[PDB]
Amino acid sequence: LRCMQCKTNGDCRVEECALGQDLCRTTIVRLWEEGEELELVEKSCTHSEKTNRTLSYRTGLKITSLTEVVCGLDLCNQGNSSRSRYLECISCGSSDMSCERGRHQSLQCRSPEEQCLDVVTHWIQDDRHLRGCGYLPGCPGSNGFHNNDTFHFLKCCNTTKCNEGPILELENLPQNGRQCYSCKGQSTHGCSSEETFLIDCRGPMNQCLVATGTHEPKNQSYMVRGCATASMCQHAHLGDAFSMNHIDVSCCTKSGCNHPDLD
Amino acid sequence: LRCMQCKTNGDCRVEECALGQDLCRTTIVRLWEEGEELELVEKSCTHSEKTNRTLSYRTGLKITSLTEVVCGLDLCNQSRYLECISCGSSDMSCERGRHQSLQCRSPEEQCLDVVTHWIKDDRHLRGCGYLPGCPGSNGFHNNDTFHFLKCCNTTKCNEGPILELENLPQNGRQCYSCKGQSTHGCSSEETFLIDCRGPMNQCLVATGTHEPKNQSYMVRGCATASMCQHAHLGDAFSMNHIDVSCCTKSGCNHPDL
Amino acid sequence: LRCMQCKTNGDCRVEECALGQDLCRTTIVRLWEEGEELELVEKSCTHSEKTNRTLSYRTGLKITSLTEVVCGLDLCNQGNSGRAVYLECISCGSSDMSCERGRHQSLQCRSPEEQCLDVVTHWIQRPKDDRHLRGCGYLPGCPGSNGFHNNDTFHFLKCCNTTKCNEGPILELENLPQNGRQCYSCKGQSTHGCSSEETFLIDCRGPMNQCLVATGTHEPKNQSYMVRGCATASMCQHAHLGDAFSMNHIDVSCCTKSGCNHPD
Amino acid sequence: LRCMQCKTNGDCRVEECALGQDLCRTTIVRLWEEGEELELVEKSCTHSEKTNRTLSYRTGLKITSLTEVVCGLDLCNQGNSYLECISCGSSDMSCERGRHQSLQCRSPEEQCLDVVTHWIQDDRHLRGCGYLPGCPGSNGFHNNDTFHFLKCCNTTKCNEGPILELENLPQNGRQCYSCKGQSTHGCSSEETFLIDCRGPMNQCLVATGTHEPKNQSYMVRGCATASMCQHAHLGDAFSMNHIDVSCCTKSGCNHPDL
Amino acid sequence: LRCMQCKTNGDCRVEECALGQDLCRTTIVRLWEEGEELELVEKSCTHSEKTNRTLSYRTGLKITSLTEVVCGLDLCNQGRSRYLECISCGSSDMSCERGRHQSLQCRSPEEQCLDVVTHWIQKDDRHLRGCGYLPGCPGSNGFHNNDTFHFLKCCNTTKCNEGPILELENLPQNGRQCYSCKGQSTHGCSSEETFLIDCRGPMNQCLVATGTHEPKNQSYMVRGCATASMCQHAHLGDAFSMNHIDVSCCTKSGCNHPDLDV
Amino acid sequence: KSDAFXXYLWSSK
Amino acid sequence: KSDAFXXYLWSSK
Amino acid sequence: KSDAFXXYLWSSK
Amino acid sequence: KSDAFXXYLWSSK
Amino acid sequence: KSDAFXXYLWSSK
Amino acid sequence: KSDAFXXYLWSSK
Ligand SMILES: *[C@H]1O[C@H](CO)[C@@H](O[C@@H]2O[C@H](CO)[C@@H](O[C@@H]3O[C@H](CO[C@H]4O[C@H](CO)[C@@H](O)[C@H](O)[C@@H]4O)[C@@H](O)[C@H](O[C@H]4O[C@H](CO)[C@@H](O)[C@H](O)[C@@H]4O)[C@@H]3O)[C@H](O)[C@H]2NC(C)=O)[C@H](O)[C@H]1NC(C)=O
Ligand SMILES: *[C@H]1O[C@H](CO)[C@@H](O[C@@H]2O[C@H](CO)[C@@H](O[C@@H]3O[C@H](CO[C@H]4O[C@H](CO)[C@@H](O)[C@H](O)[C@@H]4O)[C@@H](O)[C@H](O[C@H]4O[C@H](CO)[C@@H](O)[C@H](O)[C@@H]4O)[C@@H]3O)[C@H](O)[C@H]2NC(C)=O)[C@H](O)[C@H]1NC(C)=O
Ligand SMILES: *[C@H]1O[C@H](CO)[C@@H](O[C@@H]2O[C@H](CO)[C@@H](O[C@@H]3O[C@H](CO[C@H]4O[C@H](CO)[C@@H](O)[C@H](O)[C@@H]4O)[C@@H](O)[C@H](O[C@H]4O[C@H](CO)[C@@H](O)[C@H](O)[C@@H]4O)[C@@H]3O)[C@H](O)[C@H]2NC(C)=O)[C@H](O)[C@H]1NC(C)=O
Ligand SMILES: *[C@H]1O[C@H](CO)[C@@H](O[C@@H]2O[C@H](CO)[C@@H](O[C@@H]3O[C@H](CO[C@H]4O[C@H](CO)[C@@H](O)[C@H](O)[C@@H]4O)[C@@H](O)[C@H](O[C@H]4O[C@H](CO)[C@@H](O)[C@H](O)[C@@H]4O)[C@@H]3O)[C@H](O)[C@H]2NC(C)=O)[C@H](O)[C@H]1NC(C)=O
Ligand SMILES: *[C@@H]1O[C@H](CO[C@H]2O[C@H](C)[C@@H](O)[C@@H](O)[C@@H]2O)[C@@H](O[C@@H]2O[C@H](CO)[C@@H](O)[C@H](O)[C@H]2NC(C)=O)[C@H](O)[C@H]1NC(C)=O
Ligand SMILES: *[C@@H]1O[C@H](CO[C@H]2O[C@H](C)[C@@H](O)[C@@H](O)[C@@H]2O)[C@@H](O[C@@H]2O[C@H](CO)[C@@H](O)[C@H](O)[C@H]2NC(C)=O)[C@H](O)[C@H]1NC(C)=O
Ligand SMILES: *[C@@H]1O[C@H](CO)[C@@H](O[C@@H]2O[C@H](CO)[C@@H](O)[C@H](O)[C@H]2NC(C)=O)[C@H](O)[C@H]1NC(C)=O
Ligand SMILES: *[C@@H]1O[C@H](CO[C@H]2O[C@H](C)[C@@H](O)[C@@H](O)[C@@H]2O)[C@@H](O)[C@H](O)[C@H]1NC(C)=O
Ligand SMILES: *[C@@H]1O[C@H](CO[C@H]2O[C@H](C)[C@@H](O)[C@@H](O)[C@@H]2O)[C@@H](O)[C@H](O)[C@H]1NC(C)=O
Ligand SMILES: *[C@@H]1O[C@H](CO[C@H]2O[C@H](C)[C@@H](O)[C@@H](O)[C@@H]2O)[C@@H](O)[C@H](O)[C@H]1NC(C)=O
Ligand SMILES: *[C@@H]1O[C@H](CO[C@H]2O[C@H](C)[C@@H](O)[C@@H](O)[C@@H]2O)[C@@H](O)[C@H](O)[C@H]1NC(C)=O
Ligand SMILES: *[C@@H]1O[C@H](CO[C@H]2O[C@H](C)[C@@H](O)[C@@H](O)[C@@H]2O)[C@@H](O)[C@H](O)[C@H]1NC(C)=O
Ligand SMILES: *[C@@H]1O[C@H](CO)[C@@H](O)[C@H](O)[C@H]1NC(C)=O
Ligand SMILES: *[C@@H]1O[C@H](CO)[C@@H](O)[C@H](O)[C@H]1NC(C)=O
Ligand SMILES: *[C@@H]1O[C@H](CO)[C@@H](O)[C@H](O)[C@H]1NC(C)=O
Ligand SMILES: *[C@@H]1O[C@H](CO)[C@@H](O)[C@H](O)[C@H]1NC(C)=O
Ligand SMILES: *[C@H]1O[C@H](CO)[C@@H](O)[C@H](O)[C@H]1NC(C)=O
Ligand SMILES: *[C@H]1O[C@H](CO)[C@@H](O)[C@H](O)[C@H]1NC(C)=O
């Protein structure tokens, strides 16, 4: 209920958390380039449903890692909060060793909670494929979105090198039953009835998503419709996949139910 | 009056006090986090009713110590003593940490006991402190809440079982109890009449605001008279703007006045 | 013009100056107390009529110093401060060992432009203490005698360029010769303290032969305060003299012949 | 697109770019004050226009370097990204009798800079190393109060020689209206007049923008090279926000606009 | 010659070089302990026949890099671009017996892949693979007698330092016979304690080496088979645990007989 | 908002 | 506005 | 606001 | 507000 | 005594 | 041994 709040530059204050904010958090990104390891610590109050969460991958035997930790006690994120070798996971997608030519090459997770992560973004008209260690709410499981333009997928699993294998792509995902409308843009143009059409849903993405959001300047409303897993509506981190600012994501069950409708 | 005004981040200015503020203050907190001494310093103009005050409790044999000093001059904010129990720190809970003692680092410091029970997070804290109106017992209860602060000046006097409201005998006094907004929380038939306990023998209303955007929020219950005198007791309620009133006659805190 | 703007914590940015601001400033205060020298540095764009200025006094053989330095080239205040501060002066008025028992205590000035300063604030009687400070310093329009008085307040600033010339008895309002000018005297709002009722003629003392009306603000709200009294003319001419007054957003006016402080 | 956005005080955040800002940037300046080395770093989403650009000059055998790189990929921003030339014009190493101080450029694509601003009714002159769009080439603007000029070239020491002055740039044949201020203030009418353009400045320019206070519409009319209307870094010479620089080919057009 | 002389301390003086020492050197090691990067720098006058030499190996993707640079001028020691792919192993906790597939790209263009082995016939072994630049590379260098085996290959082909661990016992006899011994001239390397052995692989010359040990100036001697190189490059001589080292090689079988000593 | 010392008295751990 | 961890999860180099 | 130098000139003890 | 690089080109010392 | 480069070559784990 | 200044005076390039 009071937490430290700190920008990246070590500039802090004591904050009174807002109404739905009964946790303190600390975010640490550790990155590399040139010789140097670089740290970036942010702190603040945060919503009561957040949890510890982490990502890490190989950068050169230097490990890039993001870490976010959460606690519920007055000023418990004050201050600065190695065993190693646990679950073994394929790491790649790093700047240099691209998962394509970045072969196998494992990484030992440095925390017992960590699983093998496979996160992918594909544009159907520059692609990201990252594998490494990490922990997320709803792990393990397969998580994802697709429409005619975009594909986003996140998989975590908790067996040794279970993220080994060929670059995951949408066409290799078998078609499930469902079908939803696909579009990106504003309500008036991109997502109207102009560019809106039914698309065949692929893997565990058997539900229909409509995500709405904003874009600068003028806090301009923006929309995305497609196929999705249920979790795509359940987790804030999954909706972070979308390139837009204030995120509202809706699912519904039966085919086509994400027609231009409701609210 | 002019004072130094300093945020915690070390962003300072010279400040001309407002009308009701004839004092400078320096609040300093010193503590231990993961084998590292931390400090936090806040300087500003403060209200004329304010005074020197102090707090400390054990955290690892390392201590958290808190100081507010006060003075009435321009830019004026530019050995073991009394023994006390200390516990209630981040997992040295007063239930297992009872018996842990601390020599107060200041001569003025007395033994502190402070309890909040929800009838949820329960807070109990014993340590050293210097507060206005000490020694003495202070508190408040209604049907959902119990706040208590006890300060005293004999050795280890803050020893003993966790203070529990049910161990405070009935007063004869009775007051109304509600918590929240006067539409959901502090209505009518929602507000009701409870039996006061202990030295909490006066009826208390307190209005104020929450976080962030302002909403008219209030509390009523049984209270010690000091609950209405000292800001540091009124701070028990967690309310940004704050007005708190107490009267002497059974029933006087009814929704109307 | 662009300047570095910096708060006391080392938190900076590049600033475009506003229109009447063709100078960058750096302000450094060096203070002590418990045992350690604390440095306090502030930077920003500042007004064009500003200049270098400086104040120094003994605090224990350790010296307290304020230092403000000004410049007009792009980012010329970038980069920090091992850079900053001849005539021997009396120094006293620091917290302990004051100007009563502290007269005759000498300090040598660092920097040849520095002069001997004597600055005093006196209240004419919730009790509040006077301030009498001697030491080194440089201020626009130095050397000279600057000051204000009414029935409530006395502010005086004397700087002089000769050796030890800030030496002598504490300056008191009663030892300054009555000068013959008459001014209206008040403190407060234009409807409480400075209204036509509390405003009256005082006789002026010393080199303060002009009438002053100072307007400003207090908090809470932007509530307006006023100060009427006798004054030296420079009181209207130098921002740093007006800082004497216990209000924000200051506007100060002088006029010439006796009594030109009508209630309005 | 997402970029790292960072103020120079190193306050950082991930940010989604505004529509039409399809690049990230990293601006880094290194310099010398006293015997101490300073560095300022700024990161943000930027317009799809921008490109890599560079500036260097002598300061005491210590250099002031200014670097700006740009890229079009998510958080490509997260890191911290030869020819001899004359260099003078630092606060206390003037081009006026500093004309002969030289400097080895630190990048292979860097060229020699001459940048000048003259007023008559302060004057800046600077020479050093630089990489700007549309180099090599001569760029400039003059009206009856102001001369701005920028030269870049890729041959050894080509930025040597006398201070470039407007008066000894021979007139063009082409002629343009001269004014400075708001419309009705200083860019009125017949408050604005014809002048003989000289040098490569053979086109007619008008530029509209805003000086502080908050919003005050400002105008400039004069003779300019076609460049002045093309590159934002050339437009920057006019110290004004929301810049719009129009250039017409024939002589005459400056007074009845939009 | 004059050089800077600096202990890893950072304790520095000007040195007037001794006769025979006509070069200044700078040795830098950069390495990784915990999440800290360490550096040791050592500078001094060094000997006539010395050159730039390089060494690096994987540690945690972090690497241990080591550099020695030499120059002949007064006080001349005032202190992802990747190249040849090589196998790297043998570091604190990645044994060559355990991870012979595992690469590092060399950071200098001059450097080649390394394999360095020490085995004690029937003291702990050592194996190290990685990158380095050494005089007389590329090639195979080594010594063996009845008690010891030292070997250093450097090569300039991609991953060419791949393979099982090189064992002496896996090498063909080359038809050369040398005398073998290890110890004092009266104990270990005495005349009736010295005997002939068949030289294996590239080690087709006969070596005798002299020098000193602890805990005094206790003279020490080693006799065995060797590449000629063992006598030509002090870095190869460094394999022998001997102070004031004097190494001799000779071509004909039996030619390192004690009685033929020169 | 909610003052510094007050907060420690009633909330600190 | 945008989440630090979120941003890096879906975007880190 | 309040000037920092100004303030000290009239106030620093 | 002005460009950081731009400002150096035309104003810097 | 023992050269510091040699050592890494023949001893350094 | 050798003077530090001496050495640089005759050797430092
Ligand atoms: C979302 O999903 C997919 C992802 O892209 C879209 O599928 C694409 O749809 C477009 C049409 O809308 C397809 O474009 C068409 O391709 C034809 C063939 O192109 C290739 O082959 C010819 C030889 O026939 C080569 O000459 C050529 O170079 C290409 O290699 C074109 O012939 C069509 O072009 C055009 O026809 C006339 C000629 O008279 C043209 O002048 C017009 O411009 C017209 O467009 C056309 O380009 C594209 O092939 C599809 N891609 C894939 C991978 O299937 C979906 O359309 C989209 N869903 C939506 C928006 O509903
Ligand atoms: C402020 O003060 C106190 C807060 O402590 C409040 O007192 C509570 O009042 C509530 C309801 O008003 C009481 O809850 C009731 O408990 C009964 C007993 O439950 C226990 O025992 C039974 C078996 O008898 C177990 O099954 C059960 O698990 C418990 O262990 C229940 O009988 C009541 O529940 C329900 O009854 C019917 C059954 O058909 C259900 O349909 C409904 O769900 C109904 O709720 C009920 O839960 C509680 O015991 C009191 N707390 C105490 C005494 O400690 C005051 O109410 C409050 N003053 C106000 C608001 O005016
Ligand atoms: C601005 O300038 C000065 C600021 O100091 C003011 O001058 C003062 O004015 C006040 C009020 O006019 C004067 O106070 C009056 O004088 C008498 C004081 O004498 C007593 O003083 C001593 C202190 O040692 C007492 O212990 C002892 O009793 C002395 O006899 C008093 O007699 C007056 O008091 C009161 O008398 C009756 C009692 O029967 C009371 O009920 C009333 O309250 C009445 O006021 C009173 O105190 C004061 O002496 C002046 N101080 C000086 C000259 O040093 C100016 O007035 C002011 N200008 C303005 C406002 O125009
Ligand atoms: C853009 O181009 C240039 C900008 O530089 C301008 O040209 C200037 O024009 C102004 C007038 O428009 C000239 O100023 C005038 O100069 C006359 C002669 O100057 C001499 O004055 C004395 C003595 O001879 C000396 O100090 C000085 O050095 C010169 O020798 C003066 O006669 C004028 O002065 C006064 O005349 C009357 C007389 O009764 C007085 O009442 C007034 O005080 C009046 O000022 C006047 O000063 C100026 O010299 C020109 N500069 C150059 C470099 O040529 C253009 O004006 C401008 N074009 C436009 C319209 O935008
Ligand atoms: C508020 O406290 C100050 C000093 O700070 C105190 O700190 C803790 C609470 C206590 O144990 C003591 O260490 C201090 O009293 C009071 O005294 C002033 O502070 C300085 C500190 O050395 C001394 O010089 C003086 O005693 C005094 N200053 C002077 C000479 O004016 C202060 O009196 C007190 N205020 C109240 C509310 O009583
Ligand atoms: C001895 O080494 C020095 C420096 O060695 C570094 O540079 C080489 C090329 C690279 O492989 C690294 O592994 C080494 O750490 C060499 O000195 C060079 O001399 C020239 C002058 O002719 C300078 O211009 C160079 O800058 C300088 N090298 C650097 C980058 O400092 C030298 O070549 C070598 N001696 C030899 C091999 O003869
Ligand atoms: C790894 O994940 C599995 C889920 O995929 C976890 O096991 C599940 O939960 C219980 C735990 O005993 C099992 O009985 C089920 O078999 C699992 N659920 C289903 C339906 O598959 C398992 O506990 C995790 N292990 C680790 C590494 O923590
Ligand atoms: C949230 O995280 C806290 C500690 O975080 C680290 O703990 C060890 C070192 C490893 O597991 C790291 O990967 C973690 O980031 C916990 O103390 C706290 O309990 C956590 N919350 C829960 C309920 O798990
Ligand atoms: C303003 O100050 C600048 C530097 O001032 C410092 O150095 C002088 C010589 C000392 O006397 C110190 O008191 C100062 O801290 C000057 O370089 C600059 O020229 C000054 N402006 C003036 C006097 O025009
Ligand atoms: C309030 O502060 C400033 C003060 O300007 C005042 O000047 C005199 C004393 C009064 O009589 C009024 O004219 C003014 O209030 C203002 O300039 C400022 O804008 C006001 N509010 C803010 C934003 O601080
Ligand atoms: C933009 O620059 C990138 C970074 O590398 C360069 O940095 C600056 C511009 C110069 O100092 C160069 O010498 C560095 O190589 C390049 O990788 C990138 O390719 C550049 N983009 C363009 C316009 O090609
Ligand atoms: C480098 O390549 C040639 C040698 O390459 C071999 O090195 C050793 C001795 C063998 O065991 C093989 O595995 C390698 O293939 C040298 O002869 C030549 O000097 C060099 N040439 C080049 C490419 O620079
Ligand atoms: C813009 O974004 C969303 C629109 O859904 C809204 O919640 C938010 O208040 C808007 N921001 C502002 C204050 O313009
Ligand atoms: C404790 O309170 C008593 C009761 O008035 C008082 O005498 C004493 O000063 C206080 N503290 C001590 C023991 O110094
Ligand atoms: C002291 O010096 C000033 C200039 O700083 C000058 O007016 C004069 O020489 C002296 N003034 C006096 C005597 O007060
Ligand atoms: C040398 O070889 C072996 C070493 O394993 C040793 O046992 C033996 O004594 C020696 N060989 C002979 C027979 O001289
Ligand atoms: C809201 O609270 C009060 C009214 O209850 C008002 O005075 C004030 O302006 C508001 N406070 C804040 C922080 O906006
Ligand atoms: C500079 O001159 C070359 C000829 O050397 C010419 O091709 C071109 O105009 C310029 N090249 C660059 C961009 O350096």
d(CA B58, CA A84): 33
d(CA A151, CA A246): 20
Q: Is A62 on the interface with E (CB under 8 A)?
A: yes
DSSP string, C53-94: EEEEEESSSSEEEEEEEEE-STTTT-S--S-----EEE-B-S
Q: Is C11 on the interface with A (CB under 8 A)?
A: yes
Q: What are phi and psi of B188, to 5 degrees?
A: -155, 140
d(CA C227, CA F2): 36
Count of structural domains within chain A = 3
| Same domain for A183 and A163 | no
Pair B26, B57: CB distance under 8 Å: no
CB-nearest partner of K12 from E13, E15, E75:
E75
| Same domain for A91 and A143 | yes
User: DSSP state, F7?
Assistant: H
d(CA B47, CA B53): 14
Contacts of G4 in chain D (CB under 8 A): 13-14
CA distance H6 to chain B (A): 9
d(CA A230, CA A242): 16
Cβ distance C9 to A11 less than 8 Å, yes or no, reads: yes
Domain coverage including residue E231? 172-262
Pair D26, D77: CB distance under 8 Å: yes
d(CA E202, CA E143): 9
* Position E178, amino acid: C
Q: What is the CATH number of the domain that holds C254?
A: 2.10.60.10
Burial pattern B136-171, b for ≥16 Cβ within 10 A else e, equals ebbbbbbebbbbbbbbbeeebbbeeebbebeebeeb
Give the tokens for residue G11.
């975007």
For residue D127, the CA-to-ligand 12 centroid distance in Å is 51
Q: After which residues is chain E broken (C to N over 2.5 A)?
A: 79, 122
Contacts of D12 in chain A (CB under 8 A): 7-9, 40
Integer Rg of chain B from CA = 20
Q: For residue E16, what is the enclosing H or E element?
A: strand E12-16
Contacts of C128 in chain B (CB under 8 A): 72-73
Contacts of C11 in chain A (CB under 8 A): 9, 11
Give the tokens for residue C3.
């300047």
d(CA C187, CA C197): 12
Q: Which atom of ligand 1 is nearest to the CA of A197?
A: 61
Any residues with Cβ below 6 Å from ligand 4, and which?
Answer: D 120, 144, 193
d(CA E35, CA A63): 11
What is the experimental resolution, given in Å to one decimal place?
2.7
| Same domain for B188 and B117 | no
CA atoms within 13 A on the CB side of E103: 17
* Position B161, amino acid: P
| Same domain for D128 and D86 | yes
Cβ distance A215 to D80 less than 8 Å, yes or no, reads: no
Name the nearest CA neighbour of B75 among D4, C31, A130, A61.
Answer: C31
| Cis status, amide bond into A260, omega within 30 of 0 | no
Q: Is D92 on the interface with C (CB under 8 A)?
A: no
Q: At C125, is the secondary structure helix, strand, or coil?
A: coil
Q: Which experimental approach was used here? A: X-ray
Name E211's bridge partners: E220
Integer Rg of chain H from CA = 6
| Same domain for D86 and D74 | no
Phi/psi-derived region of residue A141, left when phi > 0, alpha when psi is between -120 and 50, beta in every other case: left
Phi/psi-derived region of residue C209, left when phi > 0, alpha when psi is between -120 and 50, beta in every other case: alpha
User: DSSP state, E237?
Assistant: H
| Cis status, amide bond into A140, omega within 30 of 0 | yes
CA atoms within 13 A on the CB side of C72: 10
DSSP string, B77-133: T-----EEE-B-BTTB-HHHHTT-EEE-SSSS-EEEEEEEEE----EEEEEEEE-TT
Pair C58, C24: CB distance under 8 Å: no
d(CA C185, CA C214): 11
Phi/psi-derived region of residue A232, left when phi > 0, alpha when psi is between -120 and 50, beta in every other case: alpha
Q: For residue A183, what is the enclosing H or E element?
A: strand A179-185
| Same domain for D247 and D185 | yes
Largest CA distance in chain D: 55
For residue A115, the CA-to-ligand 8 centroid distance in Å is 14
For residue C124, the CA-to-ligand 3 centroid distance in Å is 13
| Same domain for A263 and A179 | yes
Q: For residue K6, what is the enclosing H or E element?
A: helix K4-11
d(CA C252, CA E85): 79
Q: Is A35 on the interface with D (CB under 8 A)?
A: no
Q: Is the CB of B240 under 6 A from ligand 17?
A: no
Cβ distance A14 to F13 less than 8 Å, yes or no, reads: no
| Same domain for E84 and E70 | no
Q: At D154, is the secondary structure helix, strand, or coil?
A: coil
Determine the residue of chain A that is closest to G1 in CA distance: A245
CB-nearest partner of D91 from I5, I7, I13:
I13
Name E246's bridge partners: E210
Pair A32, A38: CB distance under 8 Å: yes
Q: Which of A119, A146, A173 is the last residue of a domain?
A: A173
Q: Which of B38, B59, B78 is the last residue of a domain?
A: B78
Q: Which of E171, E186, E210 is the last residue of a domain?
A: E171
Q: What are phi and psi of B94, to 5 degrees?
A: -55, -25
Q: Is the CB of B153 under 6 A from ligand 14?
A: yes
| Same domain for A164 and A108 | yes
Phi/psi-derived region of residue D34, left when phi > 0, alpha when psi is between -120 and 50, beta in every other case: left
| Same domain for E143 and E178 | no
Determine the residue of chain H that is closest to B16 in CA distance: H2
The four Cα atoms I3, I5, I6, I11 give a dihedral, to 10 degrees, of 110
Pair A42, G4: CB distance under 8 Å: yes
User: DSSP state, F10?
Assistant: H
The burial of B246, by beta-carbon neighbours within 10 Å (0-12 exposed, 13-18 middle, 19 or more buried), is given as buried
Q: Which atom of ligand 9 is nearest to the CA of C83?
A: 15
Cβ distance K7 to E73 less than 8 Å, yes or no, reads: no
| Same domain for B96 and B51 | no
| Same domain for E90 and E166 | yes
The burial of C237, by beta-carbon neighbours within 10 Å (0-12 exposed, 13-18 middle, 19 or more buried), is given as middle
CA distance A97 to chain E (A): 12
Residue of the CA atom closest to atom 11 of ligand 12: E155
Q: Is A20 on the interface with E (CB under 8 A)?
A: no
Name D247's bridge partners: D205
Q: Which ligand is nearest to the CA of A182?
A: 1
CB-nearest partner of C129 from B9, B11, B73:
B73
